Amino acid sequence: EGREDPQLLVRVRGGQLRGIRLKAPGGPVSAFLGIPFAEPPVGSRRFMPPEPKRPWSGVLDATTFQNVCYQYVDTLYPGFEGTEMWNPNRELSEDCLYLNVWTPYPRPASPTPVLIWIYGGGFYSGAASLDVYDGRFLAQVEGAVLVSMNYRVGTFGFLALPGSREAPGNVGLLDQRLALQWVQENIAAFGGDPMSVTLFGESAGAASVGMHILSLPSRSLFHRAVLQSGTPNGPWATVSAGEARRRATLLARLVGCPNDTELIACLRTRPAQDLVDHEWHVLPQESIFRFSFVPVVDGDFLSDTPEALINTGDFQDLQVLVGVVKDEGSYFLVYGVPGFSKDNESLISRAQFLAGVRIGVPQASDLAAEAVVLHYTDWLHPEDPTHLRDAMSAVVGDHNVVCPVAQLAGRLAAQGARVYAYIFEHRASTLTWPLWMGVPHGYEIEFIFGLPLDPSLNYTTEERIFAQRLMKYWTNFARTGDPNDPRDSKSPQWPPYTTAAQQYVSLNLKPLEVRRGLRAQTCAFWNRFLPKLLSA
Amino acid sequence: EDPQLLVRVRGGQLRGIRLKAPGGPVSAFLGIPFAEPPVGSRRFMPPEPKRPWSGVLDATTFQNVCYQYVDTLYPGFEGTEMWNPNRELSEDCLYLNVWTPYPRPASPTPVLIWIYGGGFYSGAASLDVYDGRFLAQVEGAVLVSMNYRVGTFGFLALPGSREAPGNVGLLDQRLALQWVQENIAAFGGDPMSVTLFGESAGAASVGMHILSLPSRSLFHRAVLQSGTPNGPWATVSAGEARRRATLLARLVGCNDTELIACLRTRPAQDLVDHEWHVLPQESIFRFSFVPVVDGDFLSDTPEALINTGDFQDLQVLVGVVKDEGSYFLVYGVPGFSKDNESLISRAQFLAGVRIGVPQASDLAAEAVVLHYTDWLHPEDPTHLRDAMSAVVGDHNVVCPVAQLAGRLAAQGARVYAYIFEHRASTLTWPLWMGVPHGYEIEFIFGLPLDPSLNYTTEERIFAQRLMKYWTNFARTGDPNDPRDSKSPQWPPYTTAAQQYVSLNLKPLEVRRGLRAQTCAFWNRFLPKLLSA
Ligand SMILES: CCN(CC)CCNS(=O)(=O)Cc1ccc(C(F)(F)F)cc1
Ligand SMILES: CCN(CC)CCNS(=O)(=O)Cc1ccc(C(F)(F)F)cc1
Ligand SMILES: *[C@@H]1O[C@H](CO)[C@@H](O)[C@H](O)[C@H]1NC(C)=O
Ligand SMILES: *[C@@H]1O[C@H](CO)[C@@H](O)[C@H](O)[C@H]1NC(C)=O
């Protein structure tokens, strides 16, 4: 080894690693990027459960981010920062089952609580190596050990012919579980506490956290959970066995593959791009906020539908943090609903609102669509282009995030879980999306991870204090199961979400303000009445 | 012999009586016959014009109230007795009353005709809350009220028969309107400025004169207080009227002609005994014998006619009170009473919705319960009590009033809409019932001006304000004082801005949208639901 930094060499079960000494604004951090945790799921292993990574010889260099899992790449606004910030930033490859580890430098003295990040992106996209997921600040400022993994997305992650051995589905979720098993065995070599491990994720990542809560094998790999703008329940996170099967055989036919063994075998002989190129063509209706290849209700990972499982499972000794941004829906309108764009004020007509309701609520019958249209329209001003636009954003945001989270928060709480609920209401001063989109899906994240602390990034001073505050909320919750400061008593307190009072806090530049009722009236509509109306 | 009290009408001569109102005398002519007594074989039949009479007919006393069911639930309680008959019950009841300033107007004076309510099942014009002296003495109006047949006697129909063709109760009102046309000028009334105004079933009847072309030549303005021709309770189909007619006939021991004959040969109370037993469901705010869609008086359904008529030369004043439904809960809904606070459970609230909305399917009462629950306090006894009253009030008055106002304003009419929010200081109902169905009436008729009625000074001032709105409406079509130059004016209800005003002790305040989101639920979505 000779003349290396002796704080950057670490042994794990698979072999030796050499990490990197990164500069964060307020000190150095240790990072170990690109650690292989499964065998490359390539060739005859495509669509299959990850096998644990065979040990390697010598010191593995762990100083670069590894390849992004093969995925669709957004082409709507080329060069626009607001979309590129989510696109992959390393080479696309099916060999992509790697994870990353940030820790204080030097590595800590006492065993430190671990935070595991699961990125979002609709189960069709995402990478643990994007800039908004950079753990250098949570490590340096809060002392935390942060772990983020790559997991297979798209067809490679979730294409299922249920019941079969060569494509049993949910293998993307099995990637994440394997990374969690990896943390249990290895994170103490870095100073992490394998007995204090908190999952947290956004969008499909938040959804995934939910599925590890509900899948009994994952339950012994973590102890607390944070779900940001996403849920295992709801209309997009899961599909029936039947629908997954229909979506898989359609894609097979679309690439020329017509007994499931012979069909998957053919799929395994196709370039990764040919699958990506046809992935969006298997959706049943014209939709937004719908993704072709997502977790399946397999009767295995998910013993039953998430709706059934949250309704009837025991959840004491489980601490959860859940929340939403203010305008969950706005982002999705520009990827489908005619009339909407990032370059226009998107002032739409009544006609277009009704057309958009059928796209944002694609599974809805004619009557249920009318019901949605009746609820959201302002009958004092039923033709105002501005109320209609913002109403269209709210249909999509309520139906896909806010009311599922409301359903999850109330059903967990009724079943003994300590729940904490927020709404994130601050719009980044640096946002490049138009004002009409408000605080869109995903723009909490740069503040949880603490990017405002980077002087070069041009956030306001208050934005930097704000980001520090939510970093302490998230980390306090990872440490204690309670986002509140023990020492800071004078500060306004964050109370648990109860079925009786339904308290939640607002996250913005002002101090915490407590509110009652997660869009209670409107989510009674989506969570109670609407199921009974398509039940007839 | 006071010549002011001698009037010659087309049917002979009358003597009225001079009454004291607080600020002066009034000429009243009570008990004037306008039709042949619909007794014996003329039962269920259209009314016939009264034959002329000899000598000078005495019209100083109130004539009998039409035969009707009498309420029993709170015996001798002022809140209920005040609506109960205050003269003898008779089928010989087709008489009307005229009040006129003393001395009689020197110029043709606008006429106000009052059509009482009582669910098409009860009511009379001799009730003290319809006392016409105040409006005649203070605003100088000529005020007319008539009796019309109620219950089986007014509205039992075997449609398309000739012995019981339906709606004779409305043909009673119609004939009174024609009597006013032929005769009112003799009292100083202006037959060319006649405003109908009524409440509950009366407001509904006023609506049916708007929609029945033969009635249009007998009035020029209308006021519909807390009642409409559209909606769930004011009409039945011919199929359904025939059902209850033949059901009542089965129940009292009785081909159409023979069936209606037997019914004629039956003491009155024998028919009223079974009046309530022909409703198809357990109900509240539902009545056994109401106007029928006959293809005659009502060419189509009221919902179809408002959706399609031409109303350009029409001016209308429509409104509701704060707590329409609350009155009806004590009359059928388990858990509710005038004598406790009627705090109810969630299950009791589910059960009440199937009676407040008796026609609704499982899915539709589900929909109603989910809408009216306060999902922040879904089990709170007080929110459920207040929501049950709102369900009943919105389903039956507020939302029909909002649908009629919308259709009228859109199709050429001039609409002025109110919400009456003041609770009488003398009210004898419990505090939780708010301002119930029917308790604006005492203030429009000016009763607080009677000092022995122990109303508060501001309530006297408030009643005089309302009397001006109504009489100004009669003279002009516009309830706004043409002298008051002060800013808050009552604006016309429009489809675009949906403005209405609030009537209470504080000055007029203008609000937009008359329970807009909730009536979109009732008028737009719920129809789509049941019919699927
Ligand atoms: C804003 C942060 N999120 C969550 C991490 C990432 C963006 N993907 S998204 O959320 O799921 C919204 C979206 C849907 C469909 C398309 C495409 F590619 F089909 F056009 C792009 C983006
Ligand atoms: C307060 C103003 N109104 C009309 C002027 C008086 C009561 N009739 S009402 O509105 O229709 C309410 C009511 C319904 C049914 C019953 C009974 F008798 F059948 F039980 C009594 C009272
Ligand atoms: C905004 O732009 C989109 C796409 O170019 C277009 O379809 C829409 O109609 C425009 N709307 C307005 C209000 O300019
Ligand atoms: C931040 O602001 C400086 C000017 O002070 C500018 O030169 C730089 O390019 C900006 N960077 C970003 C990422 O906006």
PDB file of N, CA and C in Angstrom, chain B residues 289-342:
ATOM      1  N   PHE B 289    -100.115  14.128  -1.454  1.00  0.00           N
ATOM      2  CA  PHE B 289    -100.919  14.578  -2.589  1.00  0.00           C
ATOM      3  C   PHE B 289    -100.524  16.002  -2.938  1.00  0.00           C
ATOM      4  N   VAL B 290     -99.824  16.133  -4.061  1.00  0.00           N
ATOM      5  CA  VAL B 290     -99.135  17.346  -4.502  1.00  0.00           C
ATOM      6  C   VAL B 290     -99.458  17.530  -5.979  1.00  0.00           C
ATOM      7  N   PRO B 291     -99.127  18.674  -6.594  1.00  0.00           N
ATOM      8  CA  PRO B 291     -99.407  18.849  -8.021  1.00  0.00           C
ATOM      9  C   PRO B 291     -98.886  17.686  -8.841  1.00  0.00           C
ATOM     10  N   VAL B 292     -99.590  17.412  -9.937  1.00  0.00           N
ATOM     11  CA  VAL B 292     -99.308  16.268 -10.794  1.00  0.00           C
ATOM     12  C   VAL B 292     -98.870  16.756 -12.164  1.00  0.00           C
ATOM     13  N   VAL B 293     -98.000  15.994 -12.798  1.00  0.00           N
ATOM     14  CA  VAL B 293     -97.557  16.364 -14.129  1.00  0.00           C
ATOM     15  C   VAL B 293     -98.578  15.757 -15.070  1.00  0.00           C
ATOM     16  N   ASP B 294     -99.573  16.560 -15.434  1.00  0.00           N
ATOM     17  CA  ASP B 294    -100.766  16.076 -16.108  1.00  0.00           C
ATOM     18  C   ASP B 294    -100.729  16.250 -17.616  1.00  0.00           C
ATOM     19  N   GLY B 295     -99.733  16.957 -18.150  1.00  0.00           N
ATOM     20  CA  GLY B 295     -99.760  17.348 -19.545  1.00  0.00           C
ATOM     21  C   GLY B 295    -100.765  18.434 -19.851  1.00  0.00           C
ATOM     22  N   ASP B 296    -101.164  19.208 -18.840  1.00  0.00           N
ATOM     23  CA  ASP B 296    -102.221  20.201 -18.970  1.00  0.00           C
ATOM     24  C   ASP B 296    -101.841  21.463 -18.200  1.00  0.00           C
ATOM     25  N   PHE B 297    -102.090  21.471 -16.887  1.00  0.00           N
ATOM     26  CA  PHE B 297    -101.570  22.556 -16.062  1.00  0.00           C
ATOM     27  C   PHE B 297    -100.057  22.615 -16.169  1.00  0.00           C
ATOM     28  N   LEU B 298     -99.411  21.459 -16.098  1.00  0.00           N
ATOM     29  CA  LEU B 298     -97.978  21.321 -16.317  1.00  0.00           C
ATOM     30  C   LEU B 298     -97.811  20.573 -17.637  1.00  0.00           C
ATOM     31  N   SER B 299     -97.464  21.307 -18.697  1.00  0.00           N
ATOM     32  CA  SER B 299     -97.314  20.674 -20.007  1.00  0.00           C
ATOM     33  C   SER B 299     -96.233  19.600 -19.983  1.00  0.00           C
ATOM     34  N   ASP B 300     -95.147  19.849 -19.255  1.00  0.00           N
ATOM     35  CA  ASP B 300     -94.089  18.872 -19.022  1.00  0.00           C
ATOM     36  C   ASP B 300     -93.715  18.961 -17.544  1.00  0.00           C
ATOM     37  N   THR B 301     -92.620  18.309 -17.144  1.00  0.00           N
ATOM     38  CA  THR B 301     -92.188  18.420 -15.759  1.00  0.00           C
ATOM     39  C   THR B 301     -91.646  19.823 -15.500  1.00  0.00           C
ATOM     40  N   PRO B 302     -91.701  20.298 -14.257  1.00  0.00           N
ATOM     41  CA  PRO B 302     -91.115  21.621 -13.978  1.00  0.00           C
ATOM     42  C   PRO B 302     -89.651  21.675 -14.341  1.00  0.00           C
ATOM     43  N   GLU B 303     -88.925  20.597 -14.070  1.00  0.00           N
ATOM     44  CA  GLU B 303     -87.515  20.579 -14.436  1.00  0.00           C
ATOM     45  C   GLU B 303     -87.345  20.762 -15.937  1.00  0.00           C
ATOM     46  N   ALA B 304     -88.237  20.177 -16.741  1.00  0.00           N
ATOM     47  CA  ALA B 304     -88.144  20.346 -18.190  1.00  0.00           C
ATOM     48  C   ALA B 304     -88.547  21.755 -18.623  1.00  0.00           C
ATOM     49  N   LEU B 305     -89.551  22.351 -17.964  1.00  0.00           N
ATOM     50  CA  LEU B 305     -90.041  23.662 -18.385  1.00  0.00           C
ATOM     51  C   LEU B 305     -89.106  24.794 -17.985  1.00  0.00           C
ATOM     52  N   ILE B 306     -88.528  24.747 -16.783  1.00  0.00           N
ATOM     53  CA  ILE B 306     -87.538  25.768 -16.465  1.00  0.00           C
ATOM     54  C   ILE B 306     -86.328  25.608 -17.370  1.00  0.00           C
ATOM     55  N   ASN B 307     -85.944  24.364 -17.683  1.00  0.00           N
ATOM     56  CA  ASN B 307     -84.782  24.149 -18.550  1.00  0.00           C
ATOM     57  C   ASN B 307     -84.997  24.692 -19.963  1.00  0.00           C
ATOM     58  N   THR B 308     -86.205  25.160 -20.300  1.00  0.00           N
ATOM     59  CA  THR B 308     -86.544  25.458 -21.692  1.00  0.00           C
ATOM     60  C   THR B 308     -87.422  26.690 -21.918  1.00  0.00           C
ATOM     61  N   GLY B 309     -88.068  27.271 -20.906  1.00  0.00           N
ATOM     62  CA  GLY B 309     -88.999  28.359 -21.149  1.00  0.00           C
ATOM     63  C   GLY B 309     -88.316  29.662 -21.538  1.00  0.00           C
ATOM     64  N   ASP B 310     -89.134  30.633 -21.956  1.00  0.00           N
ATOM     65  CA  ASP B 310     -88.682  31.989 -22.262  1.00  0.00           C
ATOM     66  C   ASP B 310     -89.250  32.956 -21.221  1.00  0.00           C
ATOM     67  N   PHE B 311     -88.354  33.625 -20.478  1.00  0.00           N
ATOM     68  CA  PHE B 311     -88.730  34.393 -19.294  1.00  0.00           C
ATOM     69  C   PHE B 311     -88.302  35.857 -19.364  1.00  0.00           C
ATOM     70  N   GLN B 312     -88.302  36.474 -20.553  1.00  0.00           N
ATOM     71  CA  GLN B 312     -87.690  37.797 -20.684  1.00  0.00           C
ATOM     72  C   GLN B 312     -88.466  38.869 -19.924  1.00  0.00           C
ATOM     73  N   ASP B 313     -89.784  38.923 -20.100  1.00  0.00           N
ATOM     74  CA  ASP B 313     -90.572  39.968 -19.458  1.00  0.00           C
ATOM     75  C   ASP B 313     -90.971  39.603 -18.033  1.00  0.00           C
ATOM     76  N   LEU B 314     -90.106  38.892 -17.310  1.00  0.00           N
ATOM     77  CA  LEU B 314     -90.415  38.342 -15.998  1.00  0.00           C
ATOM     78  C   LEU B 314     -89.430  38.849 -14.962  1.00  0.00           C
ATOM     79  N   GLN B 315     -89.931  39.139 -13.764  1.00  0.00           N
ATOM     80  CA  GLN B 315     -89.084  39.555 -12.653  1.00  0.00           C
ATOM     81  C   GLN B 315     -89.467  38.734 -11.434  1.00  0.00           C
ATOM     82  N   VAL B 316     -88.457  38.218 -10.733  1.00  0.00           N
ATOM     83  CA  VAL B 316     -88.641  37.186  -9.721  1.00  0.00           C
ATOM     84  C   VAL B 316     -87.768  37.519  -8.524  1.00  0.00           C
ATOM     85  N   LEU B 317     -88.245  37.153  -7.340  1.00  0.00           N
ATOM     86  CA  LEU B 317     -87.503  37.315  -6.097  1.00  0.00           C
ATOM     87  C   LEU B 317     -87.534  35.979  -5.366  1.00  0.00           C
ATOM     88  N   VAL B 318     -86.352  35.388  -5.145  1.00  0.00           N
ATOM     89  CA  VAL B 318     -86.241  34.030  -4.626  1.00  0.00           C
ATOM     90  C   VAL B 318     -85.261  34.015  -3.471  1.00  0.00           C
ATOM     91  N   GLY B 319     -85.511  33.134  -2.514  1.00  0.00           N
ATOM     92  CA  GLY B 319     -84.654  33.144  -1.351  1.00  0.00           C
ATOM     93  C   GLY B 319     -84.929  31.974  -0.442  1.00  0.00           C
ATOM     94  N   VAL B 320     -84.054  31.847   0.552  1.00  0.00           N
ATOM     95  CA  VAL B 320     -84.058  30.752   1.507  1.00  0.00           C
ATOM     96  C   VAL B 320     -83.763  31.336   2.885  1.00  0.00           C
ATOM     97  N   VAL B 321     -84.014  30.538   3.918  1.00  0.00           N
ATOM     98  CA  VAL B 321     -83.587  30.910   5.261  1.00  0.00           C
ATOM     99  C   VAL B 321     -82.364  30.086   5.644  1.00  0.00           C
ATOM    100  N   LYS B 322     -81.807  30.351   6.834  1.00  0.00           N
ATOM    101  CA  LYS B 322     -80.478  29.828   7.160  1.00  0.00           C
ATOM    102  C   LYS B 322     -80.498  28.322   7.393  1.00  0.00           C
ATOM    103  N   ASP B 323     -81.607  27.781   7.899  1.00  0.00           N
ATOM    104  CA  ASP B 323     -81.665  26.394   8.355  1.00  0.00           C
ATOM    105  C   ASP B 323     -82.926  25.697   7.836  1.00  0.00           C
ATOM    106  N   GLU B 324     -83.027  25.562   6.511  1.00  0.00           N
ATOM    107  CA  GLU B 324     -84.256  25.052   5.914  1.00  0.00           C
ATOM    108  C   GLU B 324     -84.633  23.691   6.485  1.00  0.00           C
ATOM    109  N   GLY B 325     -83.678  22.760   6.528  1.00  0.00           N
ATOM    110  CA  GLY B 325     -83.989  21.379   6.871  1.00  0.00           C
ATOM    111  C   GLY B 325     -84.335  21.113   8.326  1.00  0.00           C
ATOM    112  N   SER B 326     -83.871  21.957   9.253  1.00  0.00           N
ATOM    113  CA  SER B 326     -83.884  21.570  10.663  1.00  0.00           C
ATOM    114  C   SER B 326     -85.294  21.246  11.153  1.00  0.00           C
ATOM    115  N   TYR B 327     -86.299  22.007  10.703  1.00  0.00           N
ATOM    116  CA  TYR B 327     -87.675  21.773  11.151  1.00  0.00           C
ATOM    117  C   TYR B 327     -88.096  20.315  10.965  1.00  0.00           C
ATOM    118  N   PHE B 328     -87.720  19.704   9.841  1.00  0.00           N
ATOM    119  CA  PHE B 328     -88.275  18.419   9.440  1.00  0.00           C
ATOM    120  C   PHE B 328     -87.655  17.232  10.151  1.00  0.00           C
ATOM    121  N   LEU B 329     -86.535  17.416  10.842  1.00  0.00           N
ATOM    122  CA  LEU B 329     -85.872  16.250  11.409  1.00  0.00           C
ATOM    123  C   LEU B 329     -86.660  15.686  12.582  1.00  0.00           C
ATOM    124  N   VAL B 330     -87.340  16.548  13.343  1.00  0.00           N
ATOM    125  CA  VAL B 330     -88.089  16.099  14.513  1.00  0.00           C
ATOM    126  C   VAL B 330     -89.329  15.307  14.132  1.00  0.00           C
ATOM    127  N   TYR B 331     -89.650  15.274  12.839  1.00  0.00           N
ATOM    128  CA  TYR B 331     -90.859  14.662  12.304  1.00  0.00           C
ATOM    129  C   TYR B 331     -90.560  13.342  11.598  1.00  0.00           C
ATOM    130  N   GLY B 332     -89.678  12.529  12.166  1.00  0.00           N
ATOM    131  CA  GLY B 332     -89.388  11.258  11.538  1.00  0.00           C
ATOM    132  C   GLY B 332     -87.992  10.709  11.732  1.00  0.00           C
ATOM    133  N   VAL B 333     -86.993  11.564  11.945  1.00  0.00           N
ATOM    134  CA  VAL B 333     -85.594  11.147  11.941  1.00  0.00           C
ATOM    135  C   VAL B 333     -85.205  10.747  13.357  1.00  0.00           C
ATOM    136  N   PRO B 334     -84.863   9.478  13.611  1.00  0.00           N
ATOM    137  CA  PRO B 334     -84.511   9.059  14.971  1.00  0.00           C
ATOM    138  C   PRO B 334     -83.348   9.872  15.514  1.00  0.00           C
ATOM    139  N   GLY B 335     -83.442  10.231  16.798  1.00  0.00           N
ATOM    140  CA  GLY B 335     -82.446  11.036  17.471  1.00  0.00           C
ATOM    141  C   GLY B 335     -82.763  12.521  17.585  1.00  0.00           C
ATOM    142  N   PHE B 336     -83.713  13.040  16.810  1.00  0.00           N
ATOM    143  CA  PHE B 336     -83.985  14.470  16.792  1.00  0.00           C
ATOM    144  C   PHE B 336     -85.267  14.793  17.551  1.00  0.00           C
ATOM    145  N   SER B 337     -85.235  15.911  18.273  1.00  0.00           N
ATOM    146  CA  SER B 337     -86.342  16.370  19.097  1.00  0.00           C
ATOM    147  C   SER B 337     -86.182  17.863  19.341  1.00  0.00           C
ATOM    148  N   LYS B 338     -87.303  18.525  19.627  1.00  0.00           N
ATOM    149  CA  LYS B 338     -87.241  19.927  20.010  1.00  0.00           C
ATOM    150  C   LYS B 338     -86.790  20.110  21.448  1.00  0.00           C
ATOM    151  N   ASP B 339     -86.778  19.041  22.239  1.00  0.00           N
ATOM    152  CA  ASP B 339     -86.652  19.160  23.681  1.00  0.00           C
ATOM    153  C   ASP B 339     -85.276  18.790  24.230  1.00  0.00           C
ATOM    154  N   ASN B 340     -84.379  18.241  23.407  1.00  0.00           N
ATOM    155  CA  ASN B 340     -82.972  18.127  23.775  1.00  0.00           C
ATOM    156  C   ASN B 340     -82.146  18.716  22.636  1.00  0.00           C
ATOM    157  N   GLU B 341     -80.821  18.592  22.693  1.00  0.00           N
ATOM    158  CA  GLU B 341     -79.949  19.183  21.682  1.00  0.00           C
ATOM    159  C   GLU B 341     -79.791  18.308  20.443  1.00  0.00           C
ATOM    160  N   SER B 342     -80.381  17.110  20.436  1.00  0.00           N
ATOM    161  CA  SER B 342     -80.411  16.251  19.251  1.00  0.00           C
ATOM    162  C   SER B 342     -79.005  15.983  18.716  1.00  0.00           C
TER     163      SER B 342
END
